[PDB]
């Protein structure tokens with residue numbers, strides 16, 4: 229295309245063995261792939277990766293959107309609990325953005341597939357999950373990054389059960405959001421949005437912390453759906469009345485209090501991810517490994 233060369237991230241196209249499609253492409257196709265010698269000093273080892281590209285019916289805007297996302301991830305840098313940029317194919321052909329591969333689906337799927345009628349998750353496991361996501365967000369927020377759709381569906385799990393935050397650099401115009409548009413699992417994304425983001429369309433770090441509360445709720449409900457049966461029209465009314473989601477069963481009062489604090493009507497009174505990390509850190513060391 230028209231892309232400038234960047235030797236920091238460029239990978240020769242014959243070092244990328246393309247594989248099977250990973251999920252179905254929403255705004256851009258994602259495929260599994262194998263990269264030969266990503267490590268500059270380990271050139272004879274293959275690494276499983278995820279590759280994002282443009283559909284056939286892709287605009288110039290779609291192109292620029294993919295470029296934007298790649299450039300942001302370059303800036304933000306690497307962290308254990310986010311899907312990291314590994315490289316890119318920008319020269320002589322279609323744009324390929326290469327990121328880390330998570331073999332165990334998103335967090336919602338991961339949690340549902342381990343529901344009691346694959347080994348179950350202990351009480352410590354669930355809190356540990358919350359801790360990792362809180363760490364990924366702490367780092368992202370530290371790099372002045374706002375996710376705007378923090379949820380279990382946007383949290384992926386590696387083969388080593390490591391929570392990695394996805395789509396943190398996704399280019400999204402928040403003035404076009406179809407509030408009635410559902411996800412492919414049939415849930416309304418407006419149920420993760422803070423009130424000031426849902427009404428005044430004001431996205432901040434604090435609005436992400438609101439979303440982390442709903443994410444917390446998803447975790448201890450083992451992938452439950454927030455506000456089942458509730459349409460957009462009624463969710464508006466619920467938030468006006470200051471209504472909050474009920475406490476999940478098999479969830480401590482301390483952790484529910486954490487959700488409630490995340491769902492503080494006044495943004496300034498919500499905890500920071502820095503606090504949430506410290507709290508969850510202490511809770512992990514006080515949560516039984518025997519469920």
Ligand SMILES: *CCC(=O)Nc1ccc(Cn2nc(-c3cc4cc(C)cc(OC)c4s3)c3c(N)ncnc32)cc1
Nearest residue numbers: 250251252254258278280311327328329330394395396
């Ligand atoms: C809206 C429907 C849809 O697109 N669903 C969907 C597509 C693809 C997968 C599989 N999948 N995606 C990813 C990616 C995660 C990230 C995270 C960041 C931060 C950036 C980025 O691309 C630049 C991607 S792509 C997967 C990874 N990383 N590993 C396995 N599967 C992945 C699921 C759902």
